Amino acid sequence: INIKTGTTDIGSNTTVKTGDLVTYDKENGMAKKVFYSFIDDKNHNKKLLVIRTKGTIAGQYRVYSEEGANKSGLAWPSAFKVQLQLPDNEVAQISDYYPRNSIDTKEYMSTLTYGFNGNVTGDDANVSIGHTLKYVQPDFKTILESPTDKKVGWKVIFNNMVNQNWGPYDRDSWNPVYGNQLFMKTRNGSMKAAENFLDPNKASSLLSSGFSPDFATVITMDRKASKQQTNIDVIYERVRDDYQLHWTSTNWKGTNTKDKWTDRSSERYKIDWEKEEMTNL
Ligand SMILES: [Cl-]
């Protein structure tokens, strides 16, 4: 892509060594790309590591069940989560993360720079490193989760949605006749439940296709520290709700159980600050 790998001198006796890693999780419908950047400033007491987490999480919007023509279930992704976590015994600390706060915009973007003070600062502080964050979240919201020096996590959760001019609806919508009409195609149509689900092409590309995260986590590591190797766990995660259409005696009625299924993908990475390398275990 536009993300280069290699080593550049970004000035003031500072080097940016960048590499990449890829792991396919075909079971969970996940391609998990990681671009890492070692910012080694000879004038700073700490080496910096930017872990740009990328790839694709397929939405896997699909009809999973059918009981005659009066009942059917639907699995739809209600949340995409990326998390990074450092075990407790480690010396390394999470100094910074992007997005830094909640993002309600359908598009997020940020260009990461190094300010030669040991601080990575995002704008949308002088010279750029090779990363410009960009991701899209139609009908979705981004939320930061319990950030500490040992764990950071982003949660891209479903917000609201217009349903062929009926909407807007969310996971909590209710109607005394039709219940939750989120993905309900027709209110009184004559067809099998399996066929009365909204076309995913008429909705968020996070539902039909999927979500492509682009988050940066910054890790600081003291040079004088004894143990100069570090483990870090990176988790990609999909939460899928269960939307069921049941034919009542008169009309169609929808229900939505939250967070019924959660598919969790996890990889461990060895960080070597001296060799400035990142590898899978
Ligand atoms: Cl209504």
From Swiss-Prot:
GO terms for cellular component: extracellular region. Changing H131L: 16% of normal hemolytic activity. InterPro entries: Aerolysin/haemolysin_CS (IPR005831), Bi-component_toxin_staph (IPR003963), Leukocidin/Hemolysin_toxin (IPR016183), Leukocidin/porin_MspA_sf (IPR036435). Changing H246 to I/P/R/S: Nearly wild-type oligomerization, hemolysis and target cell binding. Its main location: secreted. It holds the Pfam family Leukocidin. It is found in: Secreted. Changing H246L: 46% of normal hemolytic activity, slowly toxic in mice. GO terms for biological process: cytolysis in another organism. Belongs to the aerolysin family. This is Alpha-hemolysin. The gene is hly.
